[PDB]
C-alpha cells in the first residue's frame, strides 16, 4: 500500500536567489538585519557532495556586487566635460628634481555658464594620462576615447562590512564542517544553516586579504591540480601581517564643471618622494613560504619548485591591486615571489581612473584623499598559477577567487517535503 508523507527532511541541489543581510554602501543596500543568534544544526550521518568550483553562490555574489557598485556610482558627478586636450609638463618638486609618476596638466574647461571657459590645472598620475602624438606635450585622460568616466561621490564609503547570504523560504544552506576538505567531493561532517557567516567583500589581486584562516594546516585548492591551465588557491592557516602606506598629505582643488558638478583633483602633494609602499615582515613571509612549499611538493614530489613574478599583462594582473582607505594601490610583489626550493618593502603605485571589473563600459574616478594613509591587513591566502621544476607565479583571476575562497564551504539546496513509501495498511474509508 502507498503512504503519502509530508514534511520529509529531504532536498535537491538548487539555484535560487539569496538575500543580502548586514554613508556606507554595503550597509545601505543590505539593510536587512542579521540573526543575532544564528543556529547551526549538525546532521548526523549525512554525506553531501560539494564543489566550490561550480558553486553558483560565487556567481551570485559577483553579480550583486557589480550591481551595487554601479548603483552607488551612477548618481554622482560625470566627468565628460573634462575630456579635452591637456597641456602636460614635468611635475617639478620643491627638490631640484621632478617627482616621477606625476604630470602637471592644464586645460580649458567650460564652467557653469556656457559662455565661459577657464584655464584650470591639476596634477595627475602618469598612469592615467595618454599621449596623443609623439614628440608632443598634448595628452588626454586614458579612458575618454573608450567609455564614460564617473567621479565617485565623496560622501559614499565602500568600506566592506561582513555580508551574510541568506536562503529564502523553502531553501536552506548546507555547510561543510570537515577542516581538511579540499573543495570538491563528499563532505562527511555537514550541518544546516539559514545564512552564511559574514564575509567581507574584498577586492584584491594576487594575494588574498582579510579572509578566514584554514585549520588543519595549509590547504592547496584547485579545480584540477594536475592541470596547469587552472588556478591554485592557497589557503593559509596563519596570517601574514601586511602594513601599507602612502607617506604623504595631498591637497585638492575643486573645479566646478556644471550646476553643482564638483570635480576634485590633486592640487599639490606634500610629503615623501616615495609615492607608496608596503611593509611585510621578512621572517613571517619566509616561514609562510616554507610551509606552502612543503604542501605544494606533496602534489609535485621529487621535483624542485620556484616562485617567480607575474609574467605579463596590465597593472591589475601584474601588481597587487587593492583598496587602501579609499585609495587605489598597485604594488610590486616581485620582492616576495622570487625564490627556489627584518622586513621587505614593496614599492607601490597609485592610480585614479580605475575599472577593477571585466567591464570597461564605465570607469570610476577616485577623487584625491587628504591626510596620510596607513592600512593594516591580514594576508590569508595566495593566488597561484602553475607553469625538472615547476614554476608558480602570483597571477590574477576574475576576482571570483575572492569569494570562492570563502564560499567553498556552502551549498544551496531546495527542500522537498513530499514523498511516498510502501506500507501494509490500506486507507480506511468511512
Amino acid at each position: 500500500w502507498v503512504t503519502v508523507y509530508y514534511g520529509v527532511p529531504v532536498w535537491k541541489d538548487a539555484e535560487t536567489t539569496l538575500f543580502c543581510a548586514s554613508h556606507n554602501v554595503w550597509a545601505t543596500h543590505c539593510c536587512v538585519p542579521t540573526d543575532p543568534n544564528p543556529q547551526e544544526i549538525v546532521l548526523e550521518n549525512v554525506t553531501e557532495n560539494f564543489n566550490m568550483w561550480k558553486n553558483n553562490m560565487v556567481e551570485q555574489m559577483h553579480e550583486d556586487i557589480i550591481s551595487l557598485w554601479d548603483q552607488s556610482l551612477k548618481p554622482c558627478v560625470k566627468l565628460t566635460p573634462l575630456c579635452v586636450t591637456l597641456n602636460c609638463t614635468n611635475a617639478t618638486a620643491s627638490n631640484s628634481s621632478i617627482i616621477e609618476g606625476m604630470k602637471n596638466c592644464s586645460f580649458n574647461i567650460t564652467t557653469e555658464l556656457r559662455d565661459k571657459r577657464e584655464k584650470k590645472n591639476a596634477l595627475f598620475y602618469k598612469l592615467d594620462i595618454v599621449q596623443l602624438d609623439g614628440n608632443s606635450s598634448q595628452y588626454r585622460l586614458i579612458n575618454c576615447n573608450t567609455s564614460a568616466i564617473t567621479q565617485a561621490c565623496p560622501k559614499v564609503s565602500f568600506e566592506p562590512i561582513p555580508i551574510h547570504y541568506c536562503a529564502p523560504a523553502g531553501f536552506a544552506i548546507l555547510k561543510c564542517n570537515n577542516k581538511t576538505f579540499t573543495g570538491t567531493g563528499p563532505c562527511n561532517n555537514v550541518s544546516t544553516v539559514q545564512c552564511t557567516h559574514g564575509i567581507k567583500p574584498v577586492v584584491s589581486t594576487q594575494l588574498l586579504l582579510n579572509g578566514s584562516l584554514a585549520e588543519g594546516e595549509i590547504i592547496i585548492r584547485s579545480e584540477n591540480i594536475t592541470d596547469n591551465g587552472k588556478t591554485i588557491l592557497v589557503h593559509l592557516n596563519e596570517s601574514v601581517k601586511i602594513e601599507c602606506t602612502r607617506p604623504n598629505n595631498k591637497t585638492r582643488t575643486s573645479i566646478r564643471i556644471g550646476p553643482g558638478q564638483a570635480f576634485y583633483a590633486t592640487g599639490q602633494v606634500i610629503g615623501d618622494i616615495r609615492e607608496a609602499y608596503c611593509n611585510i615582515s621578512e621572517s613571517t613571509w619566509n616561514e609562510t613560504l616554507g610551509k606552502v612549499v612543503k604542501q605544494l611538493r606533496k602534489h609535485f614530489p621529487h621535483k624542485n619548485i620556484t616562485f617567480q613574478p607575474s609574467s605579463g599583462g596590465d597593472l591589475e594582473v601584474t601588481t597587487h591591486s587593492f583598496n587602501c582607505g579609499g585609495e587605489f594601490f598597485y604594488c610590486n610583489t616581485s620582492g616576495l615571489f622570487n625564490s627556489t626550493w627584518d622586513s621587505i618593502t614593496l614599492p607601490c603605485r597609485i592610480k585614479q581612473i580605475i575599472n577593477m571589473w571585466q567591464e570597461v563600459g564605465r570607469a570610476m574616478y577616485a577623487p584625491p584623499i587628504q591626510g596620510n594613509i596607513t592600512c593594516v591587513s591580514n594576508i590569508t591566502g595566495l593566488i597561484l598559477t602553475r607553469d625538472n621544476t615547476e614554476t608558480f607565479r602570483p597571477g590574477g583571476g576574475d576576482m571570483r577567487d575572492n569569494w570562492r575562497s570563502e564560499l567553498y564551504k556552502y551549498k544551496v539546496v531546495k527542500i522537498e517535503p513530499l514523498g511516498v513509501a510502501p506500507t501494509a495498511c490500506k486507507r480506511r474509508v468511512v
Binding site: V2, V4, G419, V420
Partner: protein
C-alpha cells in the same frame, strides 16, 4: 529543522523585482504542494494512507528491506523515476473515491 536527515525511514518522525520574485515563488511552491495534497484527499495530514497498492515494479524489496534499512534520501533516489506515476495514481484513486461518494440515490 532537518533533524536526522541521515537516517532511515524507520526513524522517520516530525532589487525590488528580485525580492518580489523570491516572495512570489515561495508562495507558489507552498500552494502547489497544498493543492496536490488536497487533490489526493490528504489535506491537513502529515501521514495519509491511500487506496493505491504498492507496486513491485516501483520496488520489489520488502518492508524490512525498505524501511529501517534505507535513508530517506536513498529512497527518493531509488524510486525517483516513479514519482509521477504514483502521483498520477493517487489523483485517480481520489477521483474514483469521489465518483462513488457522488453517486446518486445515496447522499
Amino acid at each position: 529543522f532537518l533533524g536526522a536527515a541521515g537516517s532511515t525511514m524507520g526513524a522517520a518522525s516530525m532589487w525590488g523585482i528580485k525580492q518580489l520574485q523570491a516572495r512570489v515563488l515561495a508562495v507558489e511552491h507552498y500552494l502547489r504542494d497544498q493543492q496536490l495534497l488536497g487533490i489526493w484527499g490528504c489535506s491537513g495530514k502529515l501521514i495519509c494512507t491511500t487506496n493505491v497498492p504498492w507496486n513491485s515494479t516501483w520496488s520489489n524489496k520488502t518492508l524490512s528491506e525498505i524501511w529501517d534499512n534505507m535513508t530517506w534520501l536513498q529512497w527518493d533516489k531509488e524510486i525517483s523515476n516513479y514519482t509521477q506515476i504514483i502521483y498520477g495514481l493517487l489523483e485517480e484513486s481520489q477521483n474514483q473515491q469521489e465518483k462513488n461518494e457522488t453517486d446518486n440515490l445515496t447522499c
